[PDB]
Amino acid sequence: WEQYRDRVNMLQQERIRDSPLLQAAKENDLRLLKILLLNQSCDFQQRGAVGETALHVAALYDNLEAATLLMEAAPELAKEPALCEPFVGQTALHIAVMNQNLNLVRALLARGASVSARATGAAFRRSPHNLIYYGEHPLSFAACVGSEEIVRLLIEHGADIRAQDSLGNTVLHILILQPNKTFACQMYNLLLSYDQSLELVPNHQGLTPFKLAGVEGNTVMFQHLMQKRKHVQWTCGPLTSTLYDLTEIDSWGEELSFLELVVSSKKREARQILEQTPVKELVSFKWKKYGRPYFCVLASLYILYMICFTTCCIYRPLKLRDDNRTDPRDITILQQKLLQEAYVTHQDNIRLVGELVTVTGAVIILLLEIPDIFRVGASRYFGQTILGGPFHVIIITYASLVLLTMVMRLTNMNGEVVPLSFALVLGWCSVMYFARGFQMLGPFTIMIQKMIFGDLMRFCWLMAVVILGFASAFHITFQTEDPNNLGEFSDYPTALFSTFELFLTIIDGPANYSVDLPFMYCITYAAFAIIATLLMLNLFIAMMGDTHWRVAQERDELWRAQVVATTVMLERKMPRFLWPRSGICGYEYGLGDRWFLRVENHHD
Amino acid sequence: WEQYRDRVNMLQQERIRDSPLLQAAKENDLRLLKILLLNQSCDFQQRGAVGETALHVAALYDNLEAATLLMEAAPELAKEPALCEPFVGQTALHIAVMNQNLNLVRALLARGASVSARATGAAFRRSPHNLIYYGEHPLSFAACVGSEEIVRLLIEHGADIRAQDSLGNTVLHILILQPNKTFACQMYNLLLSYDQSLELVPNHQGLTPFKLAGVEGNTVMFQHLMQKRKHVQWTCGPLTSTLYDLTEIDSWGEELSFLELVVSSKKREARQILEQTPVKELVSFKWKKYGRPYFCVLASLYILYMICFTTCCIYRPLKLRDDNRTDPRDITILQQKLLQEAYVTHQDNIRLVGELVTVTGAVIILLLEIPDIFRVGASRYFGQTILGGPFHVIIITYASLVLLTMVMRLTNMNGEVVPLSFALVLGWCSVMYFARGFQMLGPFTIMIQKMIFGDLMRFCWLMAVVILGFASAFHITFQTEDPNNLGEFSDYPTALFSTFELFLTIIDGPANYSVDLPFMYCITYAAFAIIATLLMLNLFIAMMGDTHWRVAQERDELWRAQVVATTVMLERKMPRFLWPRSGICGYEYGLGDRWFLRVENHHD
Numbered sequence A, B: 001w002e003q004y005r006d007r008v009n010m011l012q013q014e015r016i017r018d019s020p021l022l023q024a025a026k027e028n029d030l031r032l033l034k035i036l037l038l039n040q041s042c043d044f045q046q047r048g049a050v051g052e053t054a055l056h057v058a059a060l061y062d063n064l065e066a067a068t069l070l071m072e073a074a075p076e077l078a079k080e081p082a083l084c085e086p087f088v089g090q091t092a093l094h095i096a097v098m099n100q101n102l103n104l105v106r107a108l109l110a111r112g113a114s115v116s117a118r119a120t121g122a123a124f125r126r127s128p129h130n131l132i133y134y135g136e137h138p139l140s141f142a143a144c145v146g147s148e149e150i151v152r153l154l155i156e157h158g159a160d161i162r163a164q165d166s167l168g169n170t171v172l173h174i175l176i177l178q179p180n181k182t183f184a185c186q187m188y189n190l191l192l193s194y195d196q197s198l199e200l201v202p203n204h205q206g207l208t209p210f211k212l213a214g215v216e217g218n219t220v221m222f223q224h225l226m227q228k229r230k231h232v233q234w235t236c237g238p239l240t241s242t243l244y245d246l247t248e249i250d251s252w253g254e255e256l257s258f259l260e261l262v263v264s265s266k267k268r269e270a271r272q273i274l275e276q277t278p279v280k281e282l283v284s285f286k287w288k289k290y291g292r293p294y295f296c297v298l299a300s301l302y303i304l305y306m307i308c309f310t311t312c313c314i315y316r317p318l319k320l321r322d323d324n325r326t327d328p329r330d331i332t333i334l335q336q337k338l339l340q341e342a343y344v345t346h347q348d349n350i351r352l353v354g355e356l357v358t359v360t361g362a363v364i365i366l367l368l369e370i371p372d373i374f375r376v377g378a379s380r381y382f383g384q385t386i387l388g389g390p391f392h393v394i395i396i397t398y399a400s401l402v403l404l405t406m407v408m409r410l411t412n413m414n415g416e417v418v419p420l421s422f423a424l425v426l427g428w429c430s431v432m433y434f435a436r437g438f439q440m441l442g443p444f445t446i447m448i449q450k451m452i453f454g455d456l457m458r459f460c461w462l463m464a465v466v467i468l469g470f471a472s473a474f475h476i477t478f479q480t481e482d483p484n485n486l487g488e489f490s491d492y493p494t495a496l497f498s499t500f501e502l503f504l505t506i507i508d509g510p511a512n513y514s515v516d517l518p519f520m521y522c523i524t525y526a527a528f529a530i531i532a533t534l535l536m537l538n539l540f541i542a543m544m545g546d547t548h549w550r551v552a553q554e555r556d557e558l559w560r561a562q563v564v565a566t567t568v569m570l571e572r573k574m575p576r577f578l579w580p581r582s583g584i585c586g587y588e589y590g591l592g593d594r595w596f597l598r599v600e601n602h603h604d
């Protein structure tokens, strides 16, 4: 997996060190190769550890004289690849075009070497363990490393300008998946100058190279790729009216659109590629004229439905408990009424109407949530903050708990408060999803969703051991006293709860001077103060101050991505008699079935 | 000590000012030296204050003509050193090679001056009072100041290329203990080119120069010294596979390893030398594959043992107190049971099993802690944060208090809560030691251990005088009233405790409107509010905010050092049938008994 790589590389190097002809080809001798070529009894096709040919070990250490003498001694060593596991289809041409010497590649092409030999192992394969991905073909190798006089020398010998390899990619996808981009823009331009030919082709995953430029986030290759579609109109003064093309920027023929494909990626450039001009102007116009006046009425309808659920939950049926309460610590003066007395009057008919509209809202929420999560994977939909993981989780939780409340009401079971309080508090804390489209409540809900999983997760794992270590001491100091004067510290769970409440200072310190408290309680409380309340509760404020100072641009760079996410979701969901196209047409203007855009510009 | 240096330097300068021949040699006269050399009655071997020879005072003020005329007048003044206290074995050759003139050194070597004269005083000695440490030999002087044409001129006269001096050092250790390093890398390279010869030699303390490079933290000399062992394998494309050597980086033959020697230093570069490549890759692999799956089960076993101790401490034997409580301020309804009624049932047998496993855990903690602190000094083990001083202190305290609890239980003494509460709260606050290997709770426990000794130590020395000055005023205002309406402010210790509680606002302000409080209490409380609660308690938050802003990189530069500390500690502690080696072997690959490492790299 990892140590197997060292296990095979040491074996290859040990075989190279042991074999004398390969050692001479490594050291670049002349008389030793001359005597081993003159003595014809020695074998020249001998293999090392991992398919190691003498031409391979010459080209790996760049021995031009040894390679030329080897091909003029026996030229039948270029068309034979390796056969072992990490380097399956490697060739001398492959390692020569990676090592970037023109003369050895010219000598190999003069000595009859094929240019369509494929390499399918663990070396040249898209995986996070290998450092580089160059492709599985010599033209992909040359155009990916960025040479200039090897690409013509290979294409004029017919080396598959439109090639295919593992995972269905091609040379344009390989040039897009690169971190240099400045000596790769010219290479992509030259290969597009050489040749549904090569741009509109999909891979095995279904990624046209424009959508791969999207999902990988290379903004400079995107900004060059836009300039092979940009129609330019007139210019006068300092202003110019460029006319872009959006027939790839929004799909409308396939459900998988470019914008839906780029708003739900997992990298750190899918929210920076949404700042270039012909996608920013488009989603700004479409958002400001089509996303606010439906999100506002959706938020109003959700808040109206939740106030119906809150009032229907308040007006709950209750009957007086006839069994007595002969216990000094028992209080229950109302009891949950039986189901057979739930239809008695007009008020109970109104409560029935409220229960019906609550159950209808719960089932339409569940049926509007489930078939969208069956398509996108659960990780991409529950994880990210651009899409709404920690709101869809509590929405599905609210729907399942309201359904369990309705079933528990119909089966005539006691204890309705146990799911009712949870369903109500989650359904009212889930209104925060409708605080995406407003720039006031925009970055603040991102800050609180970041602050919970960033600092409260770090802080409660060190609050739990302090309250769990101090509640036991408070209980041991107060298990030899009376529970008449000090109500707290009687049993262990109320001791734990009261120690946590004294930790957050929401309750007062226990004090009663009708008795005399023990010295051990007094000294451990005077230590508990300046260990757990003066220090740690005032260090939390400084830590969430510095997180707020340092993450003061991720919220402003993530809010635009989540508002484009809501625009794309509503454009896919709501019907298309109410969601028309974007941009001008081209059928009534002498162009034909290509929707355009016309963004006015101003420089100087 | 310090003023003695001024006392001897003024005496030397006064003797130079008083003696006429030395004054002429200072002023660089010609006719005065000519007449004092022609008049042969004058003595030339006369000594000043601290062994002051005329050749010494010529070479100290760089008088080439005076020195040449002195050696051509009487050449018997070069082989005689000084004899007084601060400058014992100083020579004209020593001060000439420090003053860096080639001609005077050539003249002294032509006039028969020895090159192995040693200087052992208070001047040339490793101590924090002297500014520089250059060594105790002329070759150490030349190679430490960094000359180029003096080192060959001295070594070709046989001036001890492999020398020894005080504290057992040599010239490579002297070149390592230097703050220049850029004109010292070439000097170290030239001396290693000139010559178990010189690299594998130890000093008197037991420091091979590689381990001295470690313990002194000079990263550039470390990064050059690594490149005399780095074996290079093939290269192709932009990636290269260097093959380092770890036979010095981890010892395995001596208990004192390089990594244990470098993780427990007291400087500010022992945590920066742990970022270079062939130690970072090694400890990253060894930590992620061998330190987490034993630290996790160690934390689980410690938390399980502490929950056994907490439950065994809760289930404590108690007998009802038969003596009466005829006192309006006495509450004791349960009394500690006698030892003879501690084995009565199955529950008391279970409590006995809990006491036995608690005492066994305490004695294995103490026997696992003590023989490790007997070897490393108490300062290095209790002080630093990389090693765990403020956790080993509270662990030894918990073990001694649990042993004192067991002895106090067997001797049938009352008052078990007095050590039991302390032992329980320290044993539960000591779980924080197992928050080193997790990157969530990593920097936060460093922040709280820094915040206590950095700000709470500064703050409680100015909280103590405010509460000690306000509790007395609150007592004087309320010693002429009734303790029936106001429970607080009755005697002085409860007045002090209630003033501290009102300082931290955990208790409410005393108010009772069934009576009339004095005007003096009212005005001093209205001053106590906006002097001690609005201001100082809200300045503490700002101070621990700015400490958190400024020490936001020492925690991220110290956490890696303490996780390498725990890796080295577990590698030394746990047995070696479960802790195997690191890196590949070299016996089955044609190298022989040298464990290697193979780190893959990528540039361009």
Ligand SMILES: O=C(CCN1C(=O)COc2ccccc21)OCc1nc2scc(-c3ccccc3)c2c(=O)[nH]1
Residues within 6 Å of the ligand: A260, A263, A264, A302, A365, A368, A369, A372, A376, A386, A387, A388, A391, A392, A395, A430, A433, A434, A565, A566, A568, A569, A573
């Ligand atoms: O209308 C919806 C949302 C469901 N709901 C309602 O009905 C009523 O009010 C709500 C209030 C709070 C929470 C949910 C609702 O459908 C599901 C849905 N929400 C989203 S948000 C971003 C995306 C997205 C877009 C493109 C790619 C990937 C993800 C997304 C999605 O794909 N589906």
Ligand SMILES: O=C(CCN1C(=O)COc2ccccc21)OCc1nc2scc(-c3ccccc3)c2c(=O)[nH]1
Residues within 6 Å of the ligand: A452, A456, A457, A458, A460, A461
């Ligand atoms: O609880 C804890 C620590 C324990 N731990 C949980 O409990 C939930 O699974 C976990 C998964 C991994 C690690 C720890 C835990 O402390 C921090 C903390 N993180 C969160 S995330 C959501 C909540 C939450 C808020 C209100 C009600 C219910 C849950 C939450 C929380 O209350 N605390």
Ligand SMILES: O=C(CCN1C(=O)COc2ccccc21)OCc1nc2scc(-c3ccccc3)c2c(=O)[nH]1
Residues within 6 Å of the ligand: B260, B263, B264, B302, B365, B368, B369, B372, B376, B386, B387, B388, B391, B392, B395, B430, B433, B434, B565, B566, B568, B569, B573
């Ligand atoms: O296993 C140990 C630690 C002792 N303990 C346990 O047994 C049980 O759980 C514990 C929980 C909290 C505290 C202690 C324990 O031994 C002692 C020990 N701890 C350390 S931490 C770093 C070093 C170190 C490494 C290299 C050089 C210098 C110091 C170190 C050490 O040398 N000894």
Ligand SMILES: O=C(CCN1C(=O)COc2ccccc21)OCc1nc2scc(-c3ccccc3)c2c(=O)[nH]1
Residues within 6 Å of the ligand: A527, A531, B452, B456, B457, B458, B460, B461
């Ligand atoms: O106490 C003080 C000041 C008095 N002073 C001690 O008392 C301990 O020796 C000292 C040594 C030098 C200077 C002052 C003191 O204020 C600050 C302060 N520093 C610390 S360090 C550990 C604790 C601690 C925490 C909980 C229980 C027991 C001790 C601590 C503390 O409570 N306060």
